[PDB]
Amino acid sequence: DVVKQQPGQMDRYLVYGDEYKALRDAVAKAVLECKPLGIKTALKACKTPQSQQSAYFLLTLFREVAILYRSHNASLHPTPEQCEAVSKFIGECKILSPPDISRFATSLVDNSVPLLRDGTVTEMAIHAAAVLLCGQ
């Protein structure tokens, strides 16, 4: 039945735990609805320090938006309106205010990230990027 039953992929960032999952689901819902306020609620509800908050935010931005950008089927690509909502929200957010974090996030939402035009390499790369940026 396996071959008859059959495109979702895994998310190894789940290694962080429940808080990344919550923030990721919140970001996905808020981007699809394009009303970036649940993002604020998730960022306030979370338990971890500011730098881990920013890292989780960056990883969610990548997993949802940048991977959607990697599909050949353009209709799945993030809509300009979603870019508008998340770009504005990043601009008004403070833990993302560090020019490097804000630039990297915005580049994920706008696909202007170098290295982000393999999958496992790309995922480890973006994880290292987030950790280095946010790691003080």
Question: What whole-number distance in Å separates Cα of residue 66 and Cα of residue 124?
Answer: 14
Residues 6+ apart with CB under 8 A from 111: 65, 66, 69
* Phi, psi for residue 30 in degrees, rounded to 5: -70, -35
Q: What is the resolution in angstroms?
A: 3.3
Do the beta carbons of residue 57 and residue 67 sit within 8 Å?
A: no
